[PDB]
Design a protein around this ligand. Structure first.
Ligand SMILES: CCCCCCCC/C=C\CCCCCCCC(=O)O
Length: 155
């Protein structure tokens, strides 16, 4: 995705309120397989799978328009994307604990993408997808064909 040349139409898209608010993880599916595919061993899988997750999306207190804040509170981790826009690429610390290049993008009007690109190894990327389904935020994570769907409800 790259539309730098003439981005007046895609200047800044404002997050649909469907993705906004605080969501607590209800359940997930095929998460272990995703972890294996992602290259996480048993130890990591013992962490990652047992990590409860709370999503927080809000208008960015940065004081600007269109921007949004998003943090990923878990049991063992914690990440806080201060002031980001969809289609925007910024540096920050992801769940993987490093401070690397990250990009968000509204790919469809019901699915946002979170892509983590490590400064050290940009090939060991990782992508989450924020889909809406019903009154739940449904995350889709796919690696090596392995899709895992994490079902988040509001708080
Ligand atoms: C599943 C990818 C985990 C990447 C970081 C692994 C090291 C830290 C341990 C556990 C991570 C907890 C978060 C798991 C992914 C949450 C995805 C999400 O819903 O945003």
């Amino acid at each position: 995705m790259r539309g730098s040349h003439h981005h007046h139409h895609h200047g800044s898209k404002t997050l649909p309120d469907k993705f906004l608010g605080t969501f607590k993880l209800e359940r997930d599916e095929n998460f272990d397989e995703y972890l294996k595919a992602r290259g996480y061993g048993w130890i990591m899988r013992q962490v990652i799978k047992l990590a409860g997750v709370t999503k927080k999306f809000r208008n960015a207190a940065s004081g600007k328009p269109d921007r949004y804040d998003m943090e990923n509170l878990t049991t063992k981790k914690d990440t806080h994307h201060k002031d980001w826009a969809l289609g925007e690429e910024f540096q920050d610390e992801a769940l993987d604990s490093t401070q690397h290049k990250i990009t968000f993008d509204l790919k469809d009007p019901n699915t946002l993408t979170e892509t983590h690109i490590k400064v050290d190894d940009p090939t060991d990327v990782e992508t989450y997808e924020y889909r809406r389904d019903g009154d739940y935020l449904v995350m889709k994570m796919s690696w090596k064909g392995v899709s895992t769907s994490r079902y988040y409800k509001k708080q």
